[PDB]
Design a protein around this ligand. Sequence first.
Ligand SMILES: CC#C[C@]1(c2cc(NC(=O)c3ccc(C#N)cn3)ccc2F)N=C(N)OCC12CC(F)(F)C2
Length: 365
Amino acid sequence: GSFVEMVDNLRGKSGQGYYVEMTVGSPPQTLNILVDTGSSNFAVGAAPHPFLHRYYQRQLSSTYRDLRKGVYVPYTQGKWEGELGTDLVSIPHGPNVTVRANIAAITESDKFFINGSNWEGILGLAYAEIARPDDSLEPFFDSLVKQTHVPNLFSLQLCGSVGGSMIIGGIDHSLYTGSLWYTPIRREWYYEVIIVRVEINGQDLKMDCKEYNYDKSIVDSGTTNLRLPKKVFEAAVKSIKAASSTEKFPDGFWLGEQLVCWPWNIFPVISLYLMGEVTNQSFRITILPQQYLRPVEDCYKFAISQSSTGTVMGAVIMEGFYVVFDRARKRIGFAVSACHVHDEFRTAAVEGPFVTLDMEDCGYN
Ligand SMILES: CC#C[C@]1(c2cc(NC(=O)c3ccc(C#N)cn3)ccc2F)N=C(N)OCC12CC(F)(F)C2
């Protein structure tokens, strides 16, 4: 219930994500590693890419073991490829343990490392099913739990130069107010959840709830935006446009093609009702414009965007909440974050219970 050593173990820069300090190899090589609940590989820079402060030097490690197997990982914005091995991995501001884990040594990439960022690898915290090349490659957290007495959960407080906490193996009650409310992990691949209802300023979108989860809904710390399926986004922007019609803005702003510069109260709250733990029971999470209007260094980007890969509950959602990935119990907890950005009139909320029928119909098959 209290893990003072792991509080404030996350750093970052606005729009560049949250990283934790890790050590790989013997003797230990310190690296900054992006915390990513949306993927399942531990993959680290291993060559002198000019964007990198530092990189894994396998030759300096007595505990390195070659798996003699490559991995090629394309995605929409470029790619990464590497050489698979294992080594001793530890987290200085995490539990006092050392695990042998899979490491993908990154040897070629495109649009992967960010120019000007301060991280040099990615910690994929999701499940084996989506690991590359396949589900036989054991994710870091699976190895951590198998090899130690660290309980099978972690929690994230993303605050938003940004900070936060990754509490590994537990919950720190000082990081949130009120109660945690839990939604079932629908399937152990991504952190998949089911959205059963959507409100803008209390006004229901009145869509078949299957649309909210077309073709999935996930909790992803490795994504900035709240991403909504095309049809849902269309309807969401329509209602946000109406609620905020005091001032007019160009079409492009709502498409994230332009910025807007200067006002919070003109903008509506967004509420996602999540499937609860009990038959016919749900709960609601509520975010402010402070979450979905991203400061760009007074200009702001509209951080709700359309998607073809489902709902992505990225930093826009997570910065309002303390988020518990309760792997042991196949559930994700949300509670109001003790660090979220708010004004004197509105705060992010987690509320329940609500009565919602046919919640199982909301999941896509
Ligand atoms: C390994 C891996 C992976 C990725 C990935 C994520 C990122 N993410 C970021 O750079 C980022 C920036 C700002 C925030 C905030 N707040 C969070 N994350 C970069 C490269 C990736 F490659 N991880 C996530 N969650 O989604 C995108 C992918 C690329 C993919 F293959 F489609 C998966």
